[PDB]
């Protein structure tokens with residue numbers, strides 16, 4: 104069998120993002136996959152990296168060190184329940200799909216917070232123990248991104264540069280760092296200015312792609328892919 | 332006269348980041364600059380983009396569109412006061428310094444949320460009115476970033492690749508997009524493994540740089556600079 108986690112970051116269920124998430128649930132479920140959705144806004148996910156992320160502290164340390172404390176907390180199974188619930192979903196997933204609108208050439212802050220807090224030292228990677236040696240090796244990940252800008256704007260000659268450029272910290276610095284193999288991104292450009300028919304086509308294209316997702320080869324998640 | 336805003340994202344006042352922020356306040360204050368610090372964790376800054384960002388009644392209360400609602404709220408002077416307070420500090424600043432530890436090759440989520448929520452359409456940019464025509468034109472911005480990884484790890488052939496690569500979404504996609512001129516980044520590598528005196532040297536180097544900050548030329552914030 105195959106298990107899929109969709110990490111979804113949009114406020115509005117009727118949005119284009121919400122439609123992309125729903126068609127992924129519907130297609131993957133039809134195939135007989137196990138599917139789970141983390142709807143970050145609906146969960147009111149905490150994005151801040153704070154001492155609340157470590158449970159069971161009787162007396163605060165004089166000096167708070169988020170990196171040291173969360174690494175230790177992971178090993179002691181004393182992370183906050185929201186984090187460990189997400190970690191269980193990741194641990195079990197064969198494929199993690201991130202569904203989000205592009206915000207400032209990156210993920211919305213609530214999703215950045217999921218990355219910062221969930222993908223902790225000892226769980227997702229170790230030092231050393233990263234990139235191909237990351238702890239989530241054997242899993243796949245995919246970014247499904249929507250944009251304001253058109254595909255042409257996101258070319259090397261366009262004002263926003265190649266779309267691949269902004270993908271580097273996400274695909275490579277985050278997903279590959281943790282040991283994921285990365286499937287090619289699904290970028291749905293400029294739905295807001297698209298016709299109704301074009302919008303429906305972008306949704307259908309995603310659904311169609313998912314029919315054969317388990318047959319895809321990952322990208323070579325290298326500097327050449329992103330910048331060459 | 333000159334006005335400086337430091338947008339600071341670290342949980343711990345005794346941290347290396349805290350020392351870099353404090354030396355910036357000390358040196359810029361000595362020069363006679365007006366200095367303000369936004370201590371995001373101390374302020375418990377909201378990172379999530381939600382309908383709480385608009386005060387009062389929404390334009391469309393049935394289907395929530397963050398971009399539309401915040402642009403209209405900006406125009407109607409109906410944004411939440413945390414956002415408007417930040418916008419006043421930015422509007423008045425000649426230089427905005429971001430002081431943060433690198434988190435997943437980007438800003439911590441709390442700082443990402445500052446960018447997402449404060450730099451709204453109508454305030455920071457318009458369409459048209461972006462890149463060099465952005466609404467924060469005539470201002471400078473600087474990233475002062477600390478890392479886990481060493482300088483060697485941040486070369487083209489190093490394990491994490493060139494540091495410039497992941498600066499793109501921040502420098503270009505955010506700061507240049509809003510009209511800032513970008514000063515060369517201050518990257519303080521691997522303080523945690525440095526000796527005490529090496530750390531003191533990195534703090535002194537930052538203070539020294541600030542002495543002559545107003546004499547610096549911006550970088551050419553191009554794809555070529557980041558990836559060539």
Ligand SMILES: Cc1cc2nc3c(=O)[nH]c(=O)nc-3n(C[C@H](O)[C@H](O)[C@H](O)COP(=O)(O)OP(=O)(O)OC[C@H]3O[C@@H](n4cnc5c(N)ncnc54)[C@H](O)[C@@H]3O)c2cc1C
Nearest residue numbers: 118119120122204205206207208249250251252295302303
């Ligand atoms: C803080 C912030 C930062 C941003 N930064 C960037 C950036 O760096 N770069 C960039 O390019 N953009 C940026 N944007 C723009 C943002 O990426 C886009 O607005 C977003 O991707 C649009 O997706 P959506 O789901 O919100 O669209 P929606 O407005 O929800 O969708 C568009 C239309 O599709 C309709 N729709 C929904 N489902 C379907 C369906 N099944 N079939 C047909 N139509 C359907 C909706 O009803 C709607 O009319 C930013 C936006 C914000 C708020």
Ligand SMILES: Cc1cc2nc3c(=O)[nH]c(=O)nc-3n(C[C@H](O)[C@H](O)[C@H](O)COP(=O)(O)OP(=O)(O)OC[C@H]3O[C@@H](n4cnc5c(N)ncnc54)[C@H](O)[C@@H]3O)c2cc1C
Nearest residue numbers: 170346347348350432433434435436477478479480530531
């Ligand atoms: C979620 C997360 C994601 C991360 N992602 C990345 C990543 O993508 N890439 C990467 O390279 N790193 C990453 N890191 C590592 C992170 O960037 C570093 O741990 C951080 O930059 C270290 O800065 P600090 O201020 O926390 O250090 P500290 O631990 O505060 O500094 C070291 C020491 O300096 C001391 N000190 C303070 N002031 C002074 C002074 N004036 N003189 C001398 N010593 C002083 C302190 O007391 C402390 O003992 C990540 C960390 C986390 C938690």
Ligand SMILES: CC1(COc2ccc3c(c2)ncn3-c2ccc3cccc(N4CCC(N)CC4)c3n2)COC1
Nearest residue numbers: 207251252253256263293295296398399450451452458
């Ligand atoms: C020119 C066209 C539109 O291209 C675009 C739009 C947004 C683009 C873009 C290219 N590159 C970047 N951003 C950004 C960047 C930051 C934003 C911070 C807040 C809000 C934004 N949005 C909200 C939605 C609104 N419709 C546009 C501004 C933002 N957008 C119309 O077809 C392409």
Ligand SMILES: CC1(COc2ccc3c(c2)ncn3-c2ccc3cccc(N4CCC(N)CC4)c3n2)COC1
Nearest residue numbers: 170171222223224230434435479480481484491521524
């Ligand atoms: C090998 C050396 C250390 O290099 C490094 C460290 C972290 C590096 C790195 C190079 N590239 C990336 N990251 C990351 C990435 C994500 C992280 C998500 C959560 C926590 C992290 N930190 C917390 C602090 C801890 N000391 C290290 C892991 C993270 N770090 C020791 O001198 C260089």
Ligand SMILES: [Zn+2]
Nearest residue numbers: 275279324325
């Ligand atoms: Zn990679």
Ligand SMILES: [Zn+2]
Nearest residue numbers: 503507552553
């Ligand atoms: Zn630029």
